[PDB]
């Protein structure tokens, strides 16, 4: 009766919740640099010396 | 070897500092890369153990 | 001995696996078209009649 | 949604079409709304039941 | 009113013609107009769409 | 050894000094060619990063 | 009112023999288990109520 | 180990495991040691009864 199969499944549930959280944190992290880079680049190409 | 209990605590804080974001991008790439390796290893141990128990718990030796 | 806790727990883990499929599926498709529309707008700004 | 058995079956089909590369966004964003809608409701039931199984501990 | 997919399809054939290297200068200005008008419309569509998922995917 | 935040901060100083329009024309060209170098240097990082996490996170 | 002890137990034994087959859909299992434990509480209190009747009566003096 | 030594050791694991105040990895490695003892104890009985069989079989 004292087999551990119940507690093992709960651990699997817990671990998956963790990756969803951290994989989302970095996925939002990269975008914050996506906007800042493309924001300064557009301001740079608006300053052409050719005209 | 790292027990199941501690890995959660290690994983828990790494999620915290990433969620803060104050770390630069280069450190974030390395750190999240190690955090996932903890998850990959921890996940495999449970799967390896459950299939070990089920055979023993069955009528098989 | 016949409580349903064990079968309930597997379902939560099983459901989580499907949510991660949806998000990484859809997230990846959006970036594909986010990048496809950027190439065309890059070509368009190469062809402006100012010169 | 239908009984919980098919609720899982429904979610499987959705992830089939999202995976297959052919879709326009305007009928994909709605789908992804339906997929998560289906999944999030499913999570609610299982969470709710487990608390009630405290009766086993009563 | 144009949906996203029809917009990107029309932009494609405008640029091919503008890039041909063969076009009177008067029509080139009507081409460039309709062009940036399509791209700017499309750019906000993805920001419009992504806003939905950020709202939808977030628990609150 | 230009880490990412070094480039961005370096770039912002360059753009702001241009828009004041105070430079002699000769060095407006000198510091516009440095502007676009850092634009592609920064972009190569994200392309490097995004391609990376995909292999790390994907099976 | 709740059925007799004997009728409560017979209902319960039919439920257990149905779960033990291990082929119901999950919703039925949860719906069946919840009413299964409900019956056991009725029987346990009814049986505990009878043991109190004998004890109070059993005293030589009816106390 | 003998039959009495095995059950005495097995009785402790059930007692401590029943309390439930164990680390998960400890519980798993303790439970799996229990099934080793049970099969070891059972073999003693089948060997003990099979020895009685040969003695009391008139031939």
UniProtKB/Swiss-Prot annotation, chains A, C:
Consequence of gene disruption = No longer processes msDNA correctly (when retron Ec78 or Ec83 are expressed in the strain).
Q: Which domain of life is it from?
A: Bacteria
Task: State its location(s).
Answer: Cytoplasm
Q: Spell out the family assignment given in the record's similarity comment.
A: Belongs to the XseA family.
What is said about its interaction partners and assembly? Answer: Heterooligomer composed of two different subunits with an approximate ratio of 4:1 for small to large subunit. Also estimated to have a 6:1 ration for small to large subunits.
> Domain comment text?
Predicted to have 4 domains. The N-terminus (about residues 1-103) binds ssDNA and is required to bind the small subunit; it probably has an OB-fold. The predicted catalytic domain is residues 104-266. Three alpha-helices are predicted in the C-terminal region (residues 267-301, 307-349 and 353-393), their removal singly or in pairs reduces small subunit-binding; none of the deletions have exonuclease activity. The extreme C-terminus (394-456) is required for exonuclease activity. The N-terminus (residues 1-257) at low levels does not confer processing of msDNA and at higher levels is lethal.
**Described function:** Bidirectionally degrades single-stranded DNA into large acid-insoluble oligonucleotides, which are then degraded further into small acid-soluble oligonucleotides. It can degrade 3' or 5' ss regions extending from the termini of duplex DNA molecules and displaced ss regions. It can also excise thymine dimers in vitro. ssDNA-binding requires both subunits. Required for production of the mature 5'-end of retron Ec78 or Ec83 msDNA.
Q: What is this protein called?
A: Exodeoxyribonuclease 7 large subunit
Whichever gene encodes this chain, its name is xseA
Q: Which residues of the intact protein are shown?
A: 305 to 355 of 456
From Swiss-Prot, chain G:
Q: Which domain of life is it from?
A: Bacteria
Query: Which keywords does UniProt give here?
Result: Cytoplasm, Exonuclease, Hydrolase, Nuclease
Enzymatic reactions = Exonucleolytic cleavage in either 5'- to 3'- or 3'- to 5'-direction to yield nucleoside 5'-phosphates
Q: Mind telling me which GO cellular component terms the entry cites? A: cytosol; exodeoxyribonuclease VII complex
Where is this chain primarily localised? cytoplasm
Q: How is the cofactor bound?
A: Does not require a metal cofactor.
In terms of pH, the activity is described as: Optimum pH is 7.8 to 7.9.
Q: Which EC class does it fall in?
A: hydrolase
One of the entry's Gene Ontology molecular-function terms is: exodeoxyribonuclease VII activity
- Give the UniProt record's GO annotations in the biological process aspect: DNA catabolic process; mismatch repair
UniProt-annotated location(s): Cytoplasm
Q: Does the keyword Isomerase apply?
A: no
Knockout consequence?
A: No longer processes msDNA correctly (when retron Ec78 or Ec83 are expressed in the strain).
Write the Enzyme Commission number(s) for this entry: 3.1.11.6
Subunit-level organization: Heterooligomer composed of two different subunits with an approximate ratio of 4:1 for small to large subunit. Also estimated to have a 6:1 ration for small to large subunits.
Family statement drawn from the similarity comment of this UniProt entry:
Belongs to the XseB family.
Q: Tell me, what does this protein do in biology? A: Bidirectionally degrades single-stranded DNA into large acid-insoluble oligonucleotides, which are then degraded further into small acid-soluble oligonucleotides. It can degrade 3' or 5' ss regions extending from the termini of duplex DNA molecules and displaced ss regions. It can also excise thymine dimers in vitro. Required for production of the mature 5'-end of retron Ec78 or Ec83 msDNA. When in excess of the large subunit, counteracts the large subunit's toxicity.
What protein name is recorded for this chain?
Exodeoxyribonuclease 7 small subunit
Q: Which organism is it from?
A: Escherichia coli (strain K12)
Source taxonomy:
Bacteria, Pseudomonadati, Pseudomonadota, Gammaproteobacteria, Enterobacterales
Gene from which the chain derives? xseB
The shown range, given as first to last of full length, is 7 to 69 of 80
From Swiss-Prot, chain H:
Cystine connections: none
Enzyme Commission (EC) number: 3.1.11.6
Instruction: Supply the enzyme class, top level.
Output: hydrolase
| Catalytic activity, reaction form | Exonucleolytic cleavage in either 5'- to 3'- or 3'- to 5'-direction to yield nucleoside 5'-phosphates
On cofactor binding, the record's note says:
Does not require a metal cofactor.
Q: Which UniProt keywords apply?
A: Cytoplasm, Exonuclease, Hydrolase, Nuclease
One Gene Ontology term of the molecular function aspect: exodeoxyribonuclease VII activity
The UniProt disruption phenotype note reads: No longer processes msDNA correctly (when retron Ec78 or Ec83 are expressed in the strain).
Any idea what job this protein has?
A: Bidirectionally degrades single-stranded DNA into large acid-insoluble oligonucleotides, which are then degraded further into small acid-soluble oligonucleotides. It can degrade 3' or 5' ss regions extending from the termini of duplex DNA molecules and displaced ss regions. It can also excise thymine dimers in vitro. Required for production of the mature 5'-end of retron Ec78 or Ec83 msDNA. When in excess of the large subunit, counteracts the large subunit's toxicity.
Q: What is this protein called?
A: Exodeoxyribonuclease 7 small subunit
């Amino acid at each position: 009766q004292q087999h551990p199969q119940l507690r093992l499944a709960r651990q699997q549930t817990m671990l998956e919740r963790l990756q969803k959280r951290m994989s989302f944190a970095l996925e939002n992290q990269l975008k914050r640099t996506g906007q800042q880079q493309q924001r300064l680049t557009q301001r740079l190409n608006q300053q052409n010396p050719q005209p | 070897p790292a027990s199941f209990e501690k890995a959660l605590s290690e994983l828990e804080q790494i999620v915290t500092r990433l969620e803060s974001g104050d770390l630069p991008l280069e450190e974030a790439l390395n750190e999240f890369e190690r955090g996932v390796q903890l998850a990959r290893q921890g996940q495999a141990k449970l799967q390896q153990a459950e299939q070990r128990v089920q055979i023993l718990l069955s009528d098989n030796e």
